[PDB]
Design a protein around this ligand. Sequence first.
Ligand SMILES: CCCCCCCCO[C@@H]1O[C@H](CO)[C@@H](O)[C@H](O)[C@H]1O
Ligand SMILES: CCCCCCCCO[C@@H]1O[C@H](CO)[C@@H](O)[C@H](O)[C@H]1O
Ligand SMILES: *[C@@H]1O[C@H](CO)[C@@H](O)[C@H](O)[C@H]1NC(C)=O
Ligand SMILES: *[C@@H]1O[C@H](CO)[C@@H](O)[C@H](O)[C@H]1NC(C)=O
Ligand SMILES: [Ca+2]
Length: 549
Amino acid sequence: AASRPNIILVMADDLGIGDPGCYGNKTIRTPNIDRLASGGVKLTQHLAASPLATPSRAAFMTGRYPVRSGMASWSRTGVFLFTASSGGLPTDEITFAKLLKDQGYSTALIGKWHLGMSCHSKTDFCHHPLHHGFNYFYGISLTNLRDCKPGEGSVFTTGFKRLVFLPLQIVGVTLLTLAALNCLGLLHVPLGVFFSLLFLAALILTLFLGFLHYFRPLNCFMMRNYEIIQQPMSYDNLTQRLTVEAAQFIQRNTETPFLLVLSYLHVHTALFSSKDFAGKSQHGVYGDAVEEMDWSVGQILNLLDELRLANDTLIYFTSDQGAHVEEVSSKGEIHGGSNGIYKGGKANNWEGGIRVPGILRWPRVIQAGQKIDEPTSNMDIFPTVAKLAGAPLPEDRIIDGRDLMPLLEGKSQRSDHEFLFHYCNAYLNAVRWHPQNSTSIWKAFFFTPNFNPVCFATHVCFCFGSYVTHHDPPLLFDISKDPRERNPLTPASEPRFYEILKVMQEAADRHTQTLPEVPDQFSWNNFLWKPWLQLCCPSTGLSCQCDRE
Ligand SMILES: CCCCCCCCO[C@@H]1O[C@H](CO)[C@@H](O)[C@H](O)[C@H]1O
Ligand SMILES: CCCCCCCCO[C@@H]1O[C@H](CO)[C@@H](O)[C@H](O)[C@H]1O
Ligand SMILES: *[C@@H]1O[C@H](CO)[C@@H](O)[C@H](O)[C@H]1NC(C)=O
Ligand SMILES: *[C@@H]1O[C@H](CO)[C@@H](O)[C@H](O)[C@H]1NC(C)=O
Ligand SMILES: [Ca+2]
């Protein structure tokens, strides 16, 4: 409360809840992170506001549901894939960084943003971290992907199939058959038609070739504030370079309260390690990466000790969302991570994607070794940190996040989340319910995905319909009793079935009455590659090579 301690927010990319040591895993080496759970609280029911990178991060930064800022899509694209697109965290939203920055904190973002860059001009940076509360930024505007490192890139495959291969095949077959018929004297085919097919194939093929050659350079680069330092992004000691920038930040603020947000690229698809982690792993390169990530955390702790700030510094650890279930290469390699006993993962509202690692450590205040089980949200630190810094919560808008200091200081035993909603981009998927006078977790599902190999089909389940199956009355679970979420409830729990789904179903109805009309930050105009938005470090246009790193 107006304490003004140092705040370190550490967010791992896609790290499953069932991967760290302090959570069940027995083979992975996540020491420094366990050396953070034993020193404080371990959230056992930490819920990310979304299964995708962009919206989850959007919710974290704002403490508001992705829909309030219109940072969730209705299409199959739930995250930004082009640095040169105009969609981003709304210029009118307020991040906890801006909040802390106004109270005089030194703010820094090290690593991944994934909330847009510019709007109308390549340099307006309307959505850049420096126009959302951060004084300093070292990292990447978009996100790490297979395509950022030559060896895979099956991120676009589904589209490559529908947009290039298949039509390339229709044209091809059409031309081969037209040639046979014409050659057989069953049809006269004018040169003008063969020309039209060749032309169309050349065009589709050139665009596809263009895409393959430029995607990586135009979308995978390193930045330092408003400038490109490395294009394309190199993996030479990436996790190490983030740490140094993080470490260097803390150090230049040993006497000023500071806010550090370390958003690692790990362990998002396209794993990697330094010379020091390559090989020794559990379930492959992923483990090699996760364990490298942990070495980074530890590196920051020892610095906190070295500088004697560890005692008056709030540290938090989490993952933007669950580990990727359907993430396996072609030559075999099984990536993605694990979410333990839980069902689902990255891209669906099944615990495995909603649930997630949540750790808090503040020596001077939080009782080390503690363990909370009440339902907590990804959006909860926005209000928690605002208080810590004495920054006032915004009153012109609603905040879904709930301060969690009373829960971590034992001043309270129940979290203010008896009604949590689970969206799937713009689509209101599930709905949780921790009844006031009970310890049961009622979870309804207005719909559910449709796991591909009975969702390796499209690489990621959706929220649309052609891959979604609605329910009426709403399907219902009781994660409190059945966490594994491997058995719907209707027989025994039938004495209050229609009863509960009446109190829950109303929530959504009364809830959706606070969802204002806001622009779709994920519309086609805000998601598509805009040439005039492309940052190109060397020359002008598209031939951007950079490495000031
Ligand atoms: C006050 C901030 C205004 C930001 C928007 C500025 C729009 C005009 O700015 C111009 O936009 C062109 C198209 O993107 C660019 O090619 C020019 O280099 C840029 O100067
Ligand atoms: C974007 C991909 C579109 C694929 C559609 C291909 C339709 C076939 O192509 C069309 O075939 C006609 C007769 O064979 C020709 O007269 C047309 O000029 C030709 O464009
Ligand atoms: C530990 O992690 C590996 C992959 O990193 C995974 O295969 C294993 O299942 C995890 N252990 C648990 C808790 O299931
Ligand atoms: C560490 O990063 C530096 C960057 O200059 C590089 O020279 C070195 O080889 C890296 N360590 C590795 C991967 O051996
Ligand atoms: Ca992610």
